[PDB]
Amino acid sequence: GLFGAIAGFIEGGWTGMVDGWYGYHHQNEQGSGYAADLKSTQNAIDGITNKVNSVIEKMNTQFTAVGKEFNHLEKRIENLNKKVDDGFLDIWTYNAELLVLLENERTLDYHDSNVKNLYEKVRSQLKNNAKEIGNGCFEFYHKCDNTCMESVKNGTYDYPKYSEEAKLNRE
Amino acid sequence: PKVRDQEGRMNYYWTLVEPGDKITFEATGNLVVPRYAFAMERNAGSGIIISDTPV
Numbered sequence: 512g513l514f515g516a517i518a519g520f521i522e523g524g525w526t527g528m529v530d531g532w533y534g535y536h537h538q539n540e541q542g543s544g545y546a547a548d549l550k551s552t553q554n555a556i557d558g559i560t561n562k563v564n565s566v567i568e569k570m571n572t573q574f575t576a577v578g579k580e581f582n583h584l585e586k587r588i589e590n591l592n593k594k595v596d597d598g599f600l601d602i603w604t605y606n607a608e609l610l611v612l613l614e615n616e617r618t619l620d621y622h623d624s625n626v627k628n629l630y631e632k633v634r635s636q637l638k639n640n641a642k643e644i645g646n647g648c649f650e651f652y653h654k655c656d657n658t659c660m661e662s663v664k665n666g667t668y669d670y671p672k673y674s675e676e677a678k679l680n681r682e
Numbered sequence: 683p684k685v686r687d688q689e690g691r692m693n694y695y696w697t698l699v700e701p702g703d704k705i706t707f708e709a710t711g712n713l714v715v716p717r718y719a720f721a722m723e724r725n726a727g728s729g730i731i732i733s734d735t736p737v
């Protein structure tokens with residue numbers, strides 16, 4: 512996309528991660544599995560929910576009847592009424608078509624942005640204790656147990672703690 | 683020209699009467715006098731639907 516993460520440097524998506532839209536997949540000595548990041552998932556949910564409502568509910572109409580009846584000696588104002596009805600039809604069709612075209616692009620970029628930013632929050636924590644092996648994965652230069660995993664996701668990874676071990680494994 | 687076997691014609695007319703007003707008919711012939719009127723009160727403007735769709 513624009514941010515180049517979805518269908519970009521992260522090739523595909525995970526049918527296994529069912530907790531949310533964005534998350535992690537880890538494996539270490541004591542197991543493996545998926546886990547969604549709810550902080551970014553909820554923000555996207557709260558944001559997309561507000562976006563659909565803003566398109567639906569900023570449309571408010573009043574009671575009106577479109578049916579006007581004109582006899583055979585009123586063809587002029589009957590064609591005028593047709594020009595009004597056909598005029599509103601052309602506008603509301605072009606607006607709705609272009610709106611859904613444009614905002615579908617924006618929404619797919621918004622999900623691309625969230626994956627990119629979620630990736631940078633992890634990269635800027637594991638500065639050189641982990642290896643950017645590409646494909647949106649990090650290989651740690653140290654043993655990272657399930658306690659350590661839950662801290663990278665939480666955003667509280669202790670760099671000075673594991674910097675000692677990762678220095679020597681880099682060789 | 684004959685329309686439903688009638689060489690003649692008959693125009694129809696209508697008008698509204700305000701609450702507390704009078705209407706006067708007067709003719710020496712050719713008047714189709716009213717028999718039933720309608721005490722009405724028209725609410726917001728609506729339309730008319732023409733369709734074979736059932737109710």
Ligand SMILES: *[C@@H]1O[C@H](CO)[C@@H](O)[C@H](O)[C@H]1NC(C)=O
Binds near residue numbers: 661665667
């Ligand atoms: C997660 O981050 C919060 C931030 O205040 C911190 O208090 C907490 O100790 C961290 N770890 C866990 C397991 O929640």
